[PDB]
Amino acid sequence: ATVKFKYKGEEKQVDISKIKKVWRVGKMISFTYDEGGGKTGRGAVSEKDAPKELLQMLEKQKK
Amino acid sequence: ATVKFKYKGEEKQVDISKIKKVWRVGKMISFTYDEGGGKTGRGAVSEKDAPKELLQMLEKQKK
DNA sequence: CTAGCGCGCTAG
DNA sequence: CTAGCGCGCTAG
């Protein structure tokens, strides 16, 4: 419930309790939360993709 | 002669005397040098695209 | 090893 | 307004 998105063709969402590795070519923050059990499961989460629980991560980071 | 690259299907190169606006989604540094006269002319210049005259720009920047 | 999600401004 | 250059790690 911290962020949401869609990969391949399935919607997915996870709270901060499963997010940690998140980089960003130049789209948003390719984050990894899970993939059915807990294998990170990358995904692209844009500040507009999460419920206001992401754009704030860049507010204190790249600001 | 500061950087080089290729857009659409044509090679192009320009010295620092014509480069200034350069951002980067997540590929390198989309820079603008010219387009036949001097209209900026964007282009993607990766640290490996320029003759060692670019990777140094990120050495002091994002390092 | 392989596609995969997107962008970023971009010029006219 | 429109395509355009690429990536980044990404999981197995």
Side-chain angles (χ1 to χ4, degrees):
Chain A
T2 274
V3 55
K4 346 197 180 202
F5 77 102
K6 187 180 163 173
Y7 167 90
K8 210 192 179 140
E10 202 100 80
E11 269 229 311
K12 280 294 185 61
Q13 183 207 237
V14 44
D15 59 6
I16 76 290
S17 97
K18 265 290 170 208
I19 305 163
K20 253 250 211 221
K21 264 294 237 153
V22 311
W23 70 97
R24 55 204 280 236
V25 181
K27 172 207 315 130
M28 41 188 68
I29 332 290
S30 237
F31 91 136
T32 65
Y33 62 95
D34 219 294
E35 55 133 24
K39 219 57 159 114
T40 340
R42 149 190 169 256
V45 306
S46 120
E47 293 197 46
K48 225 239 90 118
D49 277 3
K52 206 182 261 273
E53 197 64 21
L54 180 83
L55 58 91
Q56 170 109 104
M57 170 147 171
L58 195 81
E59 215 125 323
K60 286 172 113 240
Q61 273 276 300
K62 209 258 139 202
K63 182 201 153 185
Chain B
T2 274
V3 55
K4 346 196 180 202
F5 77 102
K6 187 180 163 173
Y7 168 90
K8 210 192 179 140
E10 202 100 80
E11 269 229 311
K12 280 294 185 61
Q13 183 207 237
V14 44
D15 59 6
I16 76 290
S17 98
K18 265 290 170 208
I19 305 163
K20 253 250 211 221
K21 264 294 237 153
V22 311
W23 70 97
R24 55 204 280 237
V25 181
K27 172 207 315 130
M28 41 188 69
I29 332 289
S30 237
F31 91 135
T32 65
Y33 62 95
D34 219 294
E35 55 133 24
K39 219 57 159 113
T40 340
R42 149 190 169 256
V45 306
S46 120
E47 293 197 46
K48 225 239 90 118
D49 277 3
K52 206 182 261 273
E53 197 64 21
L54 180 83
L55 58 91
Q56 170 109 104
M57 170 147 171
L58 195 81
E59 215 125 323
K60 286 172 113 241
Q61 273 276 300
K62 209 258 139 202
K63 182 201 153 185

PDB file of all heavy atoms in Angstrom, chain B residues 40-60:
ATOM      1  N   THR B  40      20.699  24.855 -31.431  1.00  0.00           N
ATOM      2  CA  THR B  40      20.840  23.859 -30.329  1.00  0.00           C
ATOM      3  C   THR B  40      21.050  22.458 -30.909  1.00  0.00           C
ATOM      4  O   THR B  40      22.124  21.897 -30.828  1.00  0.00           O
ATOM      5  CB  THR B  40      19.520  23.928 -29.559  1.00  0.00           C
ATOM      6  OG1 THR B  40      18.875  25.163 -29.839  1.00  0.00           O
ATOM      7  CG2 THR B  40      19.798  23.824 -28.059  1.00  0.00           C
ATOM      8  N   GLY B  41      20.032  21.889 -31.495  1.00  0.00           N
ATOM      9  CA  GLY B  41      20.176  20.527 -32.083  1.00  0.00           C
ATOM     10  C   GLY B  41      20.478  19.517 -30.973  1.00  0.00           C
ATOM     11  O   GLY B  41      21.618  19.184 -30.718  1.00  0.00           O
ATOM     12  N   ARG B  42      19.465  19.028 -30.312  1.00  0.00           N
ATOM     13  CA  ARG B  42      19.686  18.043 -29.222  1.00  0.00           C
ATOM     14  C   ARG B  42      20.375  16.791 -29.764  1.00  0.00           C
ATOM     15  O   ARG B  42      20.584  16.638 -30.951  1.00  0.00           O
ATOM     16  CB  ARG B  42      18.275  17.732 -28.699  1.00  0.00           C
ATOM     17  CG  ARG B  42      18.182  16.293 -28.170  1.00  0.00           C
ATOM     18  CD  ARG B  42      16.717  15.943 -27.892  1.00  0.00           C
ATOM     19  NE  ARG B  42      16.712  14.474 -27.643  1.00  0.00           N
ATOM     20  CZ  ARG B  42      16.285  13.659 -28.568  1.00  0.00           C
ATOM     21  NH1 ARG B  42      16.334  14.013 -29.822  1.00  0.00           N
ATOM     22  NH2 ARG B  42      15.810  12.489 -28.238  1.00  0.00           N
ATOM     23  N   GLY B  43      20.720  15.898 -28.887  1.00  0.00           N
ATOM     24  CA  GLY B  43      21.393  14.643 -29.306  1.00  0.00           C
ATOM     25  C   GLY B  43      21.795  13.884 -28.044  1.00  0.00           C
ATOM     26  O   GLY B  43      22.012  14.474 -27.010  1.00  0.00           O
ATOM     27  N   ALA B  44      21.888  12.589 -28.094  1.00  0.00           N
ATOM     28  CA  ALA B  44      22.269  11.845 -26.859  1.00  0.00           C
ATOM     29  C   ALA B  44      23.771  11.549 -26.848  1.00  0.00           C
ATOM     30  O   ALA B  44      24.268  10.784 -27.651  1.00  0.00           O
ATOM     31  CB  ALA B  44      21.455  10.552 -26.902  1.00  0.00           C
ATOM     32  N   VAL B  45      24.499  12.148 -25.940  1.00  0.00           N
ATOM     33  CA  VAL B  45      25.962  11.895 -25.877  1.00  0.00           C
ATOM     34  C   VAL B  45      26.313  11.096 -24.619  1.00  0.00           C
ATOM     35  O   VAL B  45      26.247  11.599 -23.514  1.00  0.00           O
ATOM     36  CB  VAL B  45      26.611  13.277 -25.838  1.00  0.00           C
ATOM     37  CG1 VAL B  45      26.121  14.104 -27.025  1.00  0.00           C
ATOM     38  CG2 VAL B  45      26.233  13.981 -24.534  1.00  0.00           C
ATOM     39  N   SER B  46      26.686   9.855 -24.782  1.00  0.00           N
ATOM     40  CA  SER B  46      27.043   9.009 -23.603  1.00  0.00           C
ATOM     41  C   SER B  46      28.528   9.138 -23.277  1.00  0.00           C
ATOM     42  O   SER B  46      29.348   9.385 -24.136  1.00  0.00           O
ATOM     43  CB  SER B  46      26.701   7.578 -24.025  1.00  0.00           C
ATOM     44  OG  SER B  46      27.872   6.774 -23.976  1.00  0.00           O
ATOM     45  N   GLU B  47      28.873   8.979 -22.031  1.00  0.00           N
ATOM     46  CA  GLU B  47      30.306   9.094 -21.634  1.00  0.00           C
ATOM     47  C   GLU B  47      31.200   8.348 -22.631  1.00  0.00           C
ATOM     48  O   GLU B  47      32.338   8.711 -22.847  1.00  0.00           O
ATOM     49  CB  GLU B  47      30.385   8.448 -20.252  1.00  0.00           C
ATOM     50  CG  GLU B  47      29.610   9.299 -19.244  1.00  0.00           C
ATOM     51  CD  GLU B  47      30.019   8.907 -17.823  1.00  0.00           C
ATOM     52  OE1 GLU B  47      31.208   8.783 -17.582  1.00  0.00           O
ATOM     53  OE2 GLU B  47      29.134   8.738 -16.998  1.00  0.00           O
ATOM     54  N   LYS B  48      30.695   7.308 -23.238  1.00  0.00           N
ATOM     55  CA  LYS B  48      31.520   6.543 -24.217  1.00  0.00           C
ATOM     56  C   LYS B  48      31.368   7.140 -25.619  1.00  0.00           C
ATOM     57  O   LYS B  48      32.107   6.813 -26.527  1.00  0.00           O
ATOM     58  CB  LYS B  48      30.965   5.119 -24.177  1.00  0.00           C
ATOM     59  CG  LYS B  48      32.124   4.120 -24.131  1.00  0.00           C
ATOM     60  CD  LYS B  48      32.036   3.181 -25.336  1.00  0.00           C
ATOM     61  CE  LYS B  48      32.824   3.775 -26.505  1.00  0.00           C
ATOM     62  NZ  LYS B  48      33.907   2.789 -26.778  1.00  0.00           N
ATOM     63  N   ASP B  49      30.413   8.009 -25.803  1.00  0.00           N
ATOM     64  CA  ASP B  49      30.210   8.625 -27.141  1.00  0.00           C
ATOM     65  C   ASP B  49      31.250   9.724 -27.383  1.00  0.00           C
ATOM     66  O   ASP B  49      31.823   9.826 -28.449  1.00  0.00           O
ATOM     67  CB  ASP B  49      28.801   9.216 -27.096  1.00  0.00           C
ATOM     68  CG  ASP B  49      27.778   8.121 -27.404  1.00  0.00           C
ATOM     69  OD1 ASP B  49      28.190   6.986 -27.579  1.00  0.00           O
ATOM     70  OD2 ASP B  49      26.601   8.436 -27.461  1.00  0.00           O
ATOM     71  N   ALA B  50      31.496  10.546 -26.400  1.00  0.00           N
ATOM     72  CA  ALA B  50      32.498  11.637 -26.574  1.00  0.00           C
ATOM     73  C   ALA B  50      33.914  11.091 -26.369  1.00  0.00           C
ATOM     74  O   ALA B  50      34.103  10.079 -25.725  1.00  0.00           O
ATOM     75  CB  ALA B  50      32.157  12.662 -25.492  1.00  0.00           C
ATOM     76  N   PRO B  51      34.865  11.788 -26.931  1.00  0.00           N
ATOM     77  CA  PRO B  51      36.285  11.373 -26.815  1.00  0.00           C
ATOM     78  C   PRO B  51      36.809  11.654 -25.404  1.00  0.00           C
ATOM     79  O   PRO B  51      37.722  12.433 -25.215  1.00  0.00           O
ATOM     80  CB  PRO B  51      36.997  12.248 -27.843  1.00  0.00           C
ATOM     81  CG  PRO B  51      36.122  13.451 -28.003  1.00  0.00           C
ATOM     82  CD  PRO B  51      34.708  13.014 -27.720  1.00  0.00           C
ATOM     83  N   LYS B  52      36.239  11.026 -24.413  1.00  0.00           N
ATOM     84  CA  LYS B  52      36.707  11.258 -23.016  1.00  0.00           C
ATOM     85  C   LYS B  52      36.435  12.708 -22.604  1.00  0.00           C
ATOM     86  O   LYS B  52      36.898  13.170 -21.579  1.00  0.00           O
ATOM     87  CB  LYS B  52      38.210  10.982 -23.051  1.00  0.00           C
ATOM     88  CG  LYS B  52      38.684  10.556 -21.660  1.00  0.00           C
ATOM     89  CD  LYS B  52      40.198  10.337 -21.681  1.00  0.00           C
ATOM     90  CE  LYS B  52      40.497   8.843 -21.830  1.00  0.00           C
ATOM     91  NZ  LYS B  52      40.498   8.311 -20.439  1.00  0.00           N
ATOM     92  N   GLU B  53      35.687  13.428 -23.393  1.00  0.00           N
ATOM     93  CA  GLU B  53      35.384  14.846 -23.047  1.00  0.00           C
ATOM     94  C   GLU B  53      33.977  14.954 -22.453  1.00  0.00           C
ATOM     95  O   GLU B  53      33.362  16.002 -22.475  1.00  0.00           O
ATOM     96  CB  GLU B  53      35.466  15.601 -24.374  1.00  0.00           C
ATOM     97  CG  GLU B  53      35.597  17.100 -24.102  1.00  0.00           C
ATOM     98  CD  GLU B  53      36.916  17.375 -23.378  1.00  0.00           C
ATOM     99  OE1 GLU B  53      37.800  16.539 -23.462  1.00  0.00           O
ATOM    100  OE2 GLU B  53      37.020  18.417 -22.752  1.00  0.00           O
ATOM    101  N   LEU B  54      33.466  13.879 -21.921  1.00  0.00           N
ATOM    102  CA  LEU B  54      32.106  13.915 -21.323  1.00  0.00           C
ATOM    103  C   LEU B  54      32.097  13.155 -19.997  1.00  0.00           C
ATOM    104  O   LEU B  54      31.686  13.675 -18.977  1.00  0.00           O
ATOM    105  CB  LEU B  54      31.201  13.228 -22.346  1.00  0.00           C
ATOM    106  CG  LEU B  54      29.762  13.215 -21.826  1.00  0.00           C
ATOM    107  CD1 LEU B  54      29.097  14.558 -22.132  1.00  0.00           C
ATOM    108  CD2 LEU B  54      28.982  12.093 -22.514  1.00  0.00           C
ATOM    109  N   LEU B  55      32.550  11.932 -19.996  1.00  0.00           N
ATOM    110  CA  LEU B  55      32.567  11.152 -18.728  1.00  0.00           C
ATOM    111  C   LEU B  55      33.160  12.005 -17.607  1.00  0.00           C
ATOM    112  O   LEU B  55      32.890  11.794 -16.441  1.00  0.00           O
ATOM    113  CB  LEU B  55      33.455   9.940 -19.014  1.00  0.00           C
ATOM    114  CG  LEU B  55      34.842  10.412 -19.453  1.00  0.00           C
ATOM    115  CD1 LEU B  55      35.754  10.531 -18.230  1.00  0.00           C
ATOM    116  CD2 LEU B  55      35.437   9.399 -20.434  1.00  0.00           C
ATOM    117  N   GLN B  56      33.962  12.974 -17.954  1.00  0.00           N
ATOM    118  CA  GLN B  56      34.567  13.848 -16.911  1.00  0.00           C
ATOM    119  C   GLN B  56      33.538  14.868 -16.425  1.00  0.00           C
ATOM    120  O   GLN B  56      33.626  15.378 -15.326  1.00  0.00           O
ATOM    121  CB  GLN B  56      35.734  14.550 -17.607  1.00  0.00           C
ATOM    122  CG  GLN B  56      36.282  15.651 -16.698  1.00  0.00           C
ATOM    123  CD  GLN B  56      37.658  15.241 -16.171  1.00  0.00           C
ATOM    124  OE1 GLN B  56      38.670  15.735 -16.629  1.00  0.00           O
ATOM    125  NE2 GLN B  56      37.741  14.352 -15.219  1.00  0.00           N
ATOM    126  N   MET B  57      32.553  15.164 -17.231  1.00  0.00           N
ATOM    127  CA  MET B  57      31.518  16.141 -16.802  1.00  0.00           C
ATOM    128  C   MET B  57      30.707  15.545 -15.655  1.00  0.00           C
ATOM    129  O   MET B  57      30.247  16.242 -14.773  1.00  0.00           O
ATOM    130  CB  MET B  57      30.643  16.359 -18.037  1.00  0.00           C
ATOM    131  CG  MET B  57      29.395  17.149 -17.648  1.00  0.00           C
ATOM    132  SD  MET B  57      28.893  18.207 -19.030  1.00  0.00           S
ATOM    133  CE  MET B  57      27.297  18.734 -18.356  1.00  0.00           C
ATOM    134  N   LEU B  58      30.546  14.251 -15.655  1.00  0.00           N
ATOM    135  CA  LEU B  58      29.786  13.594 -14.564  1.00  0.00           C
ATOM    136  C   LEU B  58      30.735  13.249 -13.420  1.00  0.00           C
ATOM    137  O   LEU B  58      30.316  12.952 -12.323  1.00  0.00           O
ATOM    138  CB  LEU B  58      29.200  12.326 -15.187  1.00  0.00           C
ATOM    139  CG  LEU B  58      28.107  11.766 -14.276  1.00  0.00           C
ATOM    140  CD1 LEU B  58      26.804  12.531 -14.509  1.00  0.00           C
ATOM    141  CD2 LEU B  58      27.891  10.284 -14.595  1.00  0.00           C
ATOM    142  N   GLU B  59      32.015  13.302 -13.664  1.00  0.00           N
ATOM    143  CA  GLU B  59      32.986  12.996 -12.578  1.00  0.00           C
ATOM    144  C   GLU B  59      32.882  14.076 -11.502  1.00  0.00           C
ATOM    145  O   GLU B  59      32.909  13.801 -10.319  1.00  0.00           O
ATOM    146  CB  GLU B  59      34.361  13.029 -13.248  1.00  0.00           C
ATOM    147  CG  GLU B  59      35.263  11.967 -12.618  1.00  0.00           C
ATOM    148  CD  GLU B  59      35.804  11.043 -13.711  1.00  0.00           C
ATOM    149  OE1 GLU B  59      35.062  10.754 -14.636  1.00  0.00           O
ATOM    150  OE2 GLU B  59      36.950  10.639 -13.605  1.00  0.00           O
ATOM    151  N   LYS B  60      32.752  15.306 -11.913  1.00  0.00           N
ATOM    152  CA  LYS B  60      32.629  16.416 -10.930  1.00  0.00           C
ATOM    153  C   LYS B  60      31.152  16.681 -10.619  1.00  0.00           C
ATOM    154  O   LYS B  60      30.822  17.346  -9.657  1.00  0.00           O
ATOM    155  CB  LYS B  60      33.259  17.627 -11.620  1.00  0.00           C
ATOM    156  CG  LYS B  60      34.781  17.476 -11.630  1.00  0.00           C
ATOM    157  CD  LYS B  60      35.397  18.575 -12.498  1.00  0.00           C
ATOM    158  CE  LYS B  60      36.198  19.535 -11.617  1.00  0.00           C
ATOM    159  NZ  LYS B  60      35.546  20.862 -11.803  1.00  0.00           N
TER     160      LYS B  60
END
